[PDB]
Design a protein around this ligand. Structure first.
Ligand SMILES: CCCCCCCCCCCCCCCCCC(=O)OC[C@H](CO[C@@H]1O[C@H](CO[C@H]2O[C@H](CO)[C@H](O)[C@H](O)[C@H]2O)[C@H](O)[C@H](O)[C@H]1O)OC(=O)CCCCCCCCCCCCCCCCC
Ligand SMILES: CCCCCCCCCCCCCCCCCC(=O)OC[C@H](CO[C@@H]1O[C@H](CO[C@H]2O[C@H](CO)[C@H](O)[C@H](O)[C@H]2O)[C@H](O)[C@H](O)[C@H]1O)OC(=O)CCCCCCCCCCCCCCCCC
Ligand code: CLA
Ligand code: CLA
Ligand code: CLA
Ligand SMILES: C=Cc1c(C)c2cc3nc(c4c5[nH]c(cc6nc(cc1[nH]2)C(C)=C6CC)c(C)c5C(=O)[C@@H]4C(=O)OC)[C@@H](CCC(=O)OC/C=C(\C)CCC[C@H](C)CCC[C@H](C)CCCC(C)C)[C@@H]3C
Ligand SMILES: CCCCCCCCCCCCCCCC(=O)O[C@H](COC(=O)CCCCCCCCCCCC)CO[C@@H]1O[C@@H](CO)[C@H](O)[C@H](O)[C@@H]1O
Ligand code: HEM
Ligand SMILES: CC1=C(/C=C/C(C)=C/C=C/C(C)=C/C=C/C=C(C)/C=C/C=C(C)/C=C/C2=C(C)CCCC2(C)C)C(C)(C)CCC1
Ligand SMILES: CC1=C(/C=C/C(C)=C/C=C/C(C)=C/C=C/C=C(C)/C=C/C=C(C)/C=C/C2=C(C)CCCC2(C)C)C(C)(C)CCC1
Ligand SMILES: CC1=C(/C=C/C(C)=C/C=C/C(C)=C/C=C/C=C(C)/C=C/C=C(C)/C=C/C2=C(C)CCCC2(C)C)C(C)(C)CCC1
Ligand SMILES: CCCCCCCCCCCCO[C@@H]1O[C@H](CO)[C@@H](O[C@H]2O[C@H](CO)[C@@H](O)[C@H](O)[C@H]2O)[C@H](O)[C@H]1O
Ligand SMILES: [Ca+2]
Ligand SMILES: [Fe+2]
Lengths: 34, 29, 34, 322, 30, 446, 65, 35, 339, 33, 28
């Protein structure tokens, strides 16, 4: 929609960030350190 | 692109940031 | 031909019927420990 | 009671061959598959793939070495329809259209599944951690993929694997023609999965044979010294550890057998799953990426990278098939 | 001639299976 | 926690088995993702979306679903106003913002165990009552939505139509078909060739009338379970325990997948070939007719003929009274699509009628399905399988069936995985065989 | 932590240039993106026989358009 | 001394030397770290 | 202790272990890899096969590799100076001499690995079933990349050391040499699979039998590698398999030795066939069925259908694959189906 | 159908002689006291 | 010493090829 016309990167990548959660888990393990 | 690329880089870097702030806080994990 | 049809049904029905009750009767009860 | 006693006999472990409740399906179906197989393999009327022209004799009685002999799959005329005996008009009609194929693979598959469980329901009754049935899924994945699934993508069992040593070779090559499976990534992992299986199978086989606490004389066989039920460790880890630990850097040697053997069984399995996924990805006509005209000059001429050669060879085959 | 050798060869396989499954010397413990 | 009470990290989630307070935190958060993913793709697709061209051309796996409920579609599959498509996705996002927020709340500051804060919400896995109580509510709620579909079907707007007397698009069902004759007996059909199991569903109004039952069956289910308690034969089997519940869920969820794999790949009724792209069987089917008409158009009569293969150039007479297309297409004589069936006569195609009865849309559309016959590559190199670098696509209809299958395959393994660990756990030796007394050690030795 | 802010940048830029400079072309003799078919004459400049190729590669390369 | 022979000579000459030079390095190095 | 002091230095303990073989290995090995990458990125194959697959053209990762010097370039070893290169570097890469640079430096490197896989032993005390097991890739490597080319008109016929390169080498056999049906190659597919299979079935069984030395559910850390009795009961596993598949292994020794055996024997009996196929002795038409096929066209077997396939591959692939032959086939002549 | 005339002896000797050679060794072992 | 000689003589050219990789992708 034109009222929304520009948020380029946000609408470009929403869907990748769900994957990032899986990645976050490891980093959240990294500091905790297994 | 690059403007958009910059926007994407800026838009979701809370992951690492979140952990770093939390790590500094020594909150809970 | 046609006799064979009903025959296969009866035979197949039998095993599968014999089959389920094995689990429907006390299957976990059969094991080294409990 | 008869039942309560009978039920106790099926489950019973004293049998020389354990038949669990899955065995109640497994045994009759496979025993029915083999009987209707070996016969059909030996004497098959010249099953016809296309009612138009060409009967194919894959039977053993007609001039076929084991190599060339195979059970022809069902025709295209029959399509994918469930085609049992009685539904077919005449017995010879049921053979001429490739019945025995559609008969074997059903009893085989439905036999293969129940087998996958029969390994389980024994393991549960010997009091042991039951993951074998996971490991066995890898072939069974491939079975369903090439036999049951892939023809659904083609809507006819004709394109299913003709089961036989030449039939299989015919299958791949033709399969290579259409879907370009080599360039597909999932297969390209499956190779790694198989080799690294065979590879590790050599090393983990070698390193432990290399290190043997010696209970044997030089003249006597080296094996016989192992006494079934030794509670000694038959092979030094400390000796073999540093070996591979010196051969390459000491960091990667996998100190822990329980850590090793799992990784020993993860690599081949996971390698195979991707293939049975790689096929199902093909059956739906989602193919291996074939990079073509990846190179071009400024003059529009085709620099013709290697993949085109393959792209041509496949393009060669498909015309041949029809 | 041709075929009848294969069935023969393939037969002895089966005659080995049934024979090798049941008649193996049990490897007793200890 | 750490591994000390627990097990290792790579598996570390199952540390949650006994903590319900953390457990809700998981799901609600996880459900948050699924929701968030849903709206994301919606907007993601909506930004790159072209309303003029067809949907399957766009490589579009979601908007067709929203459209299929008849919002913004228009007749002709026009895809009239995108704003309803926009509203759907964004709402799910906002909904996720709440979910994960809660998911976090139970993850941390929420009580670590629910056996105290609320006894009602409290449950023990081994309890066969208070758990079954829960199974009711969902089975009620999950049954509500099924009806809430029909609320779209019978009342609000109207759902998509595969077959309309023309245009095949939008209809508000009046009388849904319901009775055990064609419903319970419906699934009784063979799975195999020529009769789909659930994949036939010729009429739209089947599913609506059907969901009515599944609507009113599940509402009974809750009322049944809420007011009941497992019987003896239930208690003797099923291994009531934390894992097994997950294990059963998989098996059901797995078999669902293969079914979902089957619909998208075959059924034209629910997923209209129009904006989901043509079904594989229809693809070669329609292509076979476009060749037919183009040659029949000009100075040639293909009706009574032979081919170089011998079966005829186009039409054959099946063993059934109906006459079909030749070529490879003959393997699909069962297909009936919205465009083809009217062209068909009482037995097979009426050749005299085929020439005359063609429409402006049919022939065009039937030819539009010629270009797209489900195919393609992972980098999307399209056209006919070995056709060289032309018409590059992979029809979305092929993606779902591929995707959900692979996933559905794993869940079979998953089911077969936990079911092992579930029972062995209950059996107590899941921890490994016991070195003190080996169960095999003392047995009759064969 | 000391010269590893020096070595890497100065070195990595070298590889950047040999492509940009195209120095890698005449070093490894790869064809240049416009250079395959001199004139038109679309055919493979396939080197043939021995004790020649050093001179024969010259011919194919000699034309270059 | 034709092209081939001369050319071949160049190969082995520098070839052997290169191979032989490695030995010196190893030989020297070992002498350096005498335990 | 001139020679002496040198010895102990090589045999000392460091990060890695450089043995006497190490002198041979690392230089010979590091060049092979070190060569392959370079030739992959930069050196074209153009003047050789007339078709550029290399990384600096548009080509991807999978479709790049180092091709081979052409047919009429013959079996010459293409040294860096050489008669042909005459000490000129550029034309020594364009001719694909870099290929041979890889093989030879590879082989000796490949050898040098083997020797290392000995020299470890005598100073450790293990028995050398490792090196001996490693002779299978040797035979495979030597047979494929060395004996096979020499049985042809030139080096031109050989794998090109690449992901896609090896594929145009695969179909290359199926069309011409009819490789799948070669029985020596069926023993191979036994070995590999038979290796992979038993690889997975061993790793699964021992993973399903564990004495439970630790507490937590996950048993990895549960293992203590100190003078322990066998970490998994052979007793269970034996009686286990004996009741399902019917036949088990009662010897940890006889088992593992059987793992070492099958993959190895799998390759050698394949490495024989390839040698047999270097001479173009390829397993091919069974005189029985062929003659029978001359007694009627209607008789058809899944064998006969392969011959058409192997016929099509040849004709279509020939002009591109072998430009040096200067084949031009007319259109109709291609053995198209529907005819 | 037509065949190598002598090919049959091949199998027989290739079957029996290796087979027999395994039996003879085995029956011996059975006789070991 | 010994270790340093390994990576230095190995990973250094890697950094030098990464130039060729990247600086190529911007050609054409
Ligand atoms: C591990 C991996 C496991 C793999 C093995 C399991 C595979 C799961 C199979 C999915 C179950 C659903 C099968 C299905 O709905 O089965 C249907 C599918 C395809 O169904 C086809 O469906 C066609 C439906 O077409 C028509 O029907 C459509 C739907 O009604 C529309 O009406 C439209 O007009 C038209 O397309 C016809 O019914 C054909 O006769 C029929 O073959 O068949 C099938 O593979 C039938 C064989 C699957 C049966 C397996 C038996 C398991 C016990
Ligand atoms: C295991 C150990 C691990 C492996 C270690 C491998 C390292 C060593 C690799 C050996 C490869 C060296 C290549 C030898 C070669 O090409 O050396 C050259 C000869 C092969 O020569 C071929 O000989 C051909 C024969 O042509 C003859 O006929 C022609 C007719 O016009 C001409 O007259 C020509 O002059 C005349 O020689 C042509 O000369 C070809 O150009 C040439 O390739 O091999 C010979 O010497 C070598 C003889 C042994 C080869 C065994 C192959 C037998 C099968
Ligand atoms: C319905 C979903 C579901 C749920 C809720 C659970 C729940 C559980 N499973 Mg489980 N499982 C399921 C399905 C499910 N399972 C299925 C379908 C399988 C078969 C694949 C398994 C196989 C399985 C095993 C083998 C194990 C569990 C375990 C567990 C427990 C801990 C979770 C865990 O190990 O996370 C672990 C999380 C990770 C290891 C991180 C994920 C890393 C993987 C590799 C991601 C790769 C996927 C990705 C798409 C591929 C790469 C991306 C690509 C682009 C390259 C927990 C009770 C563990 C257990 O012992 O249970 C008690 C355990 O060992 N599960
Ligand atoms: C993606 C699904 C998922 C979910 C919902 C969870 C959830 C959970 N895991 Mg977990 N896990 C997962 C995947 C998941 N896991 C995978 C894939 C692995 C394998 C890699 C693991 C491995 C693992 C281990 C090994 C353990 C857990 C544990 C836990 C629990 C406590 C974690 C904790 O202390 O958080 C604390 C979190 C933080 C201190 C910071 C996290 C970062 C924040 C939450 C980011 C916020 C998200 C987003 C940006 C904001 C949304 C809200 C917004 C609207 C305002 C928690 C319920 C632990 C457990 O047993 O439970 C007690 C535990 O020991 N997990
Ligand atoms: C299906 C999802 C789900 C479930 C089962 C629960 C369950 C629970 N939540 Mg809850 N919550 C959720 C999602 C969920 N939450 C989400 C998504 C949010 C974000 C909006 C919250 C925000 C939230 C808050 C802020 C609080 C709870 C509280 C509670 C507890 C008591 C609630 C109660 O009886 O209210 C009684 C109300 C009626 C019966 C009406 C209970 C354990 C309360 C709590 O911590 O108690 C332990 C509490 O104060 N929840
Ligand atoms: C995919 C095939 C394959 C690969 C890649 C492979 C690789 C390896 N196996 C090794 C070992 C083994 N392999 C064994 C059995 C087997 N290995 C097999 C198959 C393989 N084995 C098979 C099928 C078997 C029988 C089942 C054994 C028994 C061993 C070992 O003992 C040993 C080990 O312990 O593993 C660590 C290692 C020795 C490497 C070495 O000395 O490098 C140094 C050699 C060099 C650098 C020479 C160069 C290599 C060749 C000549 C040139 C390569 C060309 C380019 C570099 C790249 C080509 C590009 C390709 C895409 C074609 C290495 C990790
Ligand atoms: C025409 C197609 C033919 C198809 C062939 C299919 C089977 C081939 C499997 C591969 C060979 C056997 C592998 C084990 C070798 C071994 O070593 O098993 C030995 C006896 O095995 C054998 O003599 C195997 C003889 C045939 C096996 C029959 C399998 C029956 C399957 C029934 C399926 C039911 C659903 C006994 O084991 C060893 O025997 C002694 C060796 O020193 C010691 O006891 C060792 O510790 C160990 O116990
Ligand atoms: C011209 C290039 C380089 C020079 C001159 C250089 C310099 C040095 C020197 C003199 C040392 C030993 C003294 C010390 O450790 O402080 C060293 C150590 C090290 N440097 Fe570099 N460096 C270079 C490139 C690199 C690169 C590309 C890497 C990539 C990882 C690297 C990583 C290291 C490492 C790992 C060590 C430890 C050596 C060991 O542990 O034996 N350096 N560097
Ligand atoms: C922004 C935004 C938002 C938000 C979102 C978020 C917040 C997200 C998150 C994110 C995430 C969640 C992220 C994460 C991160 C991650 C990363 C960054 C990753 C990387 C990687 C890593 C680091 C890994 C690691 C590793 C390695 C590397 C190797 C080894 C292994 C391991 C694994 C360890 C919203 C919605 C509002 C919308 C608007 C915008
Ligand atoms: C028709 C239709 C419909 C509806 C739906 C329905 C009506 C369905 C139903 C379905 C169902 C409702 C199904 C069922 C099935 C069955 C099953 C699958 C279940 C599960 C369970 C079981 C199987 C059990 C198990 C077991 C056994 C077997 C043995 C013993 C043990 C146990 C018990 C565990 C619709 C609308 C959609 C559409 C149209 C058509
Ligand atoms: C030829 C020659 C030579 C050689 C050279 C050399 C020595 C080279 C170098 C070598 C080397 C040593 C190099 C290296 C390089 C490397 C590379 C270039 C790599 C890369 C990598 C990559 C690209 C990876 C990727 C990835 C993956 C796979 C996954 C994850 C992610 C990532 C991205 C990481 C010489 C001079 C001697 C002599 C003359 C001639
Ligand atoms: C569990 C095991 C069960 C195994 C079941 C099968 C066992 C039966 C074995 C009987 C074999 C009879 O073997 C039979 O040999 C003859 C001649 O030798 C073959 O006959 C072959 O030569 C004759 C002429 O001599 C030709 O006319 C014929 O067309 C050709 O096939 C038969 O095709 C084969 O069937
Ligand atoms: Ca974009
Ligand atoms: Fe082993």
């Amino acid at each position: 929609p034109e009222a929304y016309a520009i948020f380029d990167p946000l609408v470009d990548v929403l869907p990748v960030i769900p994957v990032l959660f899986l990645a976050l888990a490891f980093v959240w393990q990294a500091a905790v350190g297994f | 692109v690059i403007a958009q690329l910059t926007m994407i880089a800026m838009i979701g870097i809370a992951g690492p940031m979140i952990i770093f702030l939390l790590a500094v806080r020594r909150g809970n994990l | 031909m046609e006799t064979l049809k009903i025959t296969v049904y009866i035979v197949v029905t039998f095993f599968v019927l014999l089959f389920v009750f094995g689990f429907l009767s006390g299957d976990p009860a059969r094991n080294p420990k409990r | 009671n008869l039942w309560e006693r009978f039920c106790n006999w099926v489950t019973s472990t004293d049998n020389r061959l354990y038949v669990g409740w899955f065995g109640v399906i497994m045994i009759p179906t496979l025993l029915a598959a083999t009987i209707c197989f070996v016969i059909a393999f030996i004497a098959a009327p010249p099953v016809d793939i296309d009612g138009i022209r060409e009967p194919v004799s894959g039977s053993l009685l007609y001039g076929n070495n084991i190599i060339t002999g195979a059970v022809v799959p069902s025709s295209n005329a029959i399509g994918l329809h469930f085609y049992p005996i009685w539904e077919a008009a005449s017995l010879d009609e049921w053979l001429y259209n490739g019945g025995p194929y559609q008969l074997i693979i059903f009893h085989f598959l439905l036999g293969a599944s129940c087998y996958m469980g029969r390994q389980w329901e024994l393991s549960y009754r010997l009091g042991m951690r039951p993951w074998i049935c996971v490991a066995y899924s890898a072939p069974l994945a491939s079975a369903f993929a090439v036999f049951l699934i892939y023809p659904i993508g083609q809507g006819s069992f004709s394109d299913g694997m003709p089961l036989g040593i030449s039939g299989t070779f015919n299958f791949m090559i033709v399969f290579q023609a259409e879907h370009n499976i080599l360039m597909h990534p999932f297969h390209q992992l499956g190779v790694a999965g198989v080799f690294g299986g065979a590879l590790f199978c050599a090393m983990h086989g070698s390193l432990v044979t290399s290190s043997l606490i010696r209970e044997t004389t030089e003249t006597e066989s080296a094996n016989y010294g192992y006494k079934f039920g030794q509670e000694e460790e038959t092979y030094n880890i400390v000796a073999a550890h540093g070996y591979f630990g010196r051969l390459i850097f000491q960091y990667a040697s996998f100190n822990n057998s329980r850590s090793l053997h799992f990784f020993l069984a993860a690599w081949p399995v996971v390698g195979v799953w991707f293939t049975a996924l790689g096929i199902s990805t093909m059956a739906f006509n989602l193919n291996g990426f074939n990079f073509n005209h990846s190179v071009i000059d400024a003059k529009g001429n085709v620099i013709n990278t290697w993949a085109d050669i393959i792209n041509r060879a496949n393009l060669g085959m498909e015309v041949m098939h029809e | 001639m041709e075929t009848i050798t294969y069935v023969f060869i393939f037969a002895c396989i089966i005659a080995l299976f049934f024979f090798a499954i049941f008649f193996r010397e049990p490897p007793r413990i200890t | 926690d750490q591994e000390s009470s627990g097990f290792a990290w790579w598996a570390g989630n199952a540390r949650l088995i006994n903590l319900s307070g953390k457990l809700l935190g998981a799901h609600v958060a996880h459900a948050g993702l699924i929701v968030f993913w849903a709206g994301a793709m919606t907007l993601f697709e909506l930004a790159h979306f072209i309303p003029e061209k067809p949907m399957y051309e766009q490589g579009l796996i979601l908007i067709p679903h929203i459209a299929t409920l008849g919002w913004g579609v228009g007749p002709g599959g026009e895809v009239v106003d995108t704003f309803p498509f926009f509203v759907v996705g964004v709402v799910h996002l906002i909904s996720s913002a709440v979910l994960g927020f809660g998911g976090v709340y139970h993850a941390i500051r929420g009580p670590e165990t629910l056996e105290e804060y609320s006894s009602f919400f409290g449950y023990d896995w081994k309890d066969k009552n208070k758990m079954t109580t829960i199974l009711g509510f969902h089975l009620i709620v999950l049954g509500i939505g099924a009806l809430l579909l029909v609320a779209k079907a019978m009342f609000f707007g109207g759902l998509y139509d595969t077959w309309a007397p023309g245009g095949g698009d939008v209809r508000v069902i009046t009388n849904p078909t319901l009775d055990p004759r064609v419903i319970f007996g419906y699934l009784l059909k063979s799975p195999f060739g020529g009769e789909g199991w659930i994949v036939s569903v010729n009429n739209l109004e089947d599913v609506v009338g059907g969901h009515i039952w599944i609507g009113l069956i599940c509402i009974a289910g809750g009322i049944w379970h809420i007011l009941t308690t497992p019987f003896g034969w239930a208690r003797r089997a099923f291994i009531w325990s934390g894992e097994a519940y997950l294990s059963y869920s998989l098996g059901a969820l797995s078999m669902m997948g293969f079914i979902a794999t089957c619909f998208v790949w075959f059924n034209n009724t629910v997923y209209p070939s129009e904006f989901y792209g043509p079904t594989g069987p229809e693809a070669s089917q329609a292509q076979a007719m476009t060749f037919l008409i183009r040659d029949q158009k000009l100075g040639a009569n293909v009706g009574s003929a032979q081919g170089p293969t011998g079966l005829g150039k186009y039409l054959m007479r099946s063993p059934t009274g109906e006459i079909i297309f030749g070529g490879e297409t003959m393997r699909f004589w069962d297909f009936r699509g919205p465009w083809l069936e009217p062209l068909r006569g009482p037995n097979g195609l009426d050749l005299n009628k085929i020439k005359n009865d063609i429409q402006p849309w049919q022939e065009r559309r039937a030819a539009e399905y010629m270009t797209h016959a489900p195919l393609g590559s992972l980098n999307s190199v399209g056209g006919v399988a070995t056709e060289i670098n032309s018409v590059n696509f992979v029809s979305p209809r092929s993606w779902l069936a591929t995707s959900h299958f692979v996933l559905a395959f794993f869940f079979l393994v998953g089911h077969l995985w936990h079911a092992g660990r579930a029972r062995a756990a209950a059996a107590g030796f899941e921890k490994g065989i016991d070195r003190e007394s080996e169960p095999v050690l003392s047995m009759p030795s064969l | 932590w000391v010269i590893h802010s020096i070595t890497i940048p100065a070195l990595f830029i070298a590889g950047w240039l040999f492509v940009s400079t195209g120095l890698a072309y005449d070093v490894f003799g790869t064809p240049r993106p416009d250079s395959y078919y001199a004139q038109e004459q679309r055919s493979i400049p396939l080197v043939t026989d021995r004790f020649e190729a050093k001179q024969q590669v010259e011919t194919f390369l000699e034309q270059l358009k | 001394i034709t092209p081939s022979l001369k050319g071949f000579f160049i190969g082995l000459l520098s070839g052997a030397v290169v191979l032989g030079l490695t030995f010196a390095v190893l030989i020297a190095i070992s002498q350096i770290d005498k335990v | 202790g001139w020679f002496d002091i040198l010895d102990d230095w090589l045999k000392r303990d460091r990060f890695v272990f450089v043995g006497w073989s190490g002198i041979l290995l690392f230089p010979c090995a590091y060049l092979a890899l070190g060569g392959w990458l370079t030739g992959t990125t930069f050196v074209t194959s153009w003047y050789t096969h007339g078709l550029a697959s290399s990384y600096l053209e548009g080509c991807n990762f999978l479709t790049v590799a180092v091709s081979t010097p052409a047919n009429s370039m013959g079996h010459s070893l293409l040294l860096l100076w050489g008669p042909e290169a005459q000490g000129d570097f550029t034309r020594w890469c364009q001719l694909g001499g870099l290929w041979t640079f890889i093989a030879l430096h590879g082989a000796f490197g490949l050898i040098g690995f083997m020797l290392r896989q000995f020299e470890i032993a005598r100073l450790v005390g293990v028995r050398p079933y490792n090196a001996i097991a490693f002779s299978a890739p040797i035979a495979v490597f030597v047979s494929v990349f060395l004996i096979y080319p020499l049985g042809q008109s030139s080096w031109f016929f050989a794998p090109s050391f690449g992901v896609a390169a090896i594929f145009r080498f695969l179909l290359f056999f199926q069309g011409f040499h009819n490789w799948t049906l070669n029985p020596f190659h069926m023993m191979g597919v036994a070995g590999v699979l038979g290796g992979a299979l038993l690889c997975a079935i061993h790793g699964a069984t021992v993973e399903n039998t564990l004495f439970q030395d630790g507490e937590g559910a996950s048993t990895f850390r549960a293992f203590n590698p100190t003078q322990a009795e066998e970490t998994y009961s052979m007793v269970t596993a034996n009686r286990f398999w004996s009741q399902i598949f019917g036949i088990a292994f009662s010897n940890k020794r006889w088992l593992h030795f059987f793992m070492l055996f099958v993959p190895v024997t799998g390759l050698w009996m394949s490495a024989i066939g390839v040698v047999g196929l270097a001479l173009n002795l390829r397993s091919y038409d069974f005189i029985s069925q062929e003659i029978r096929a001359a007694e009627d066209p209607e008789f058809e077997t899944f064998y006969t259908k392969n011959l058409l396939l192997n016929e099509g591959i040849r004709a279509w692939m020939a002009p591109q694959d072998q430009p040096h032959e200067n084949f031009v086939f007319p259109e109709e002549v291609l053995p198209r189906g529907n005819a | 159908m037509e065949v190598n005339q002598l090919g049959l002896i091949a199998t027989a000797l290739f079957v029996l002689v290796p087979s027999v050679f395994l039996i003879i060794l085995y029956v011996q072992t059975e006789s070991q006291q | 010493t010994v270790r340093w000689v390994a990576v230095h003589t190995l990973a250094v050219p890697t950094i030098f090829f990464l130039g060729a990789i990247a600086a190529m992708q911007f050609i054409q």
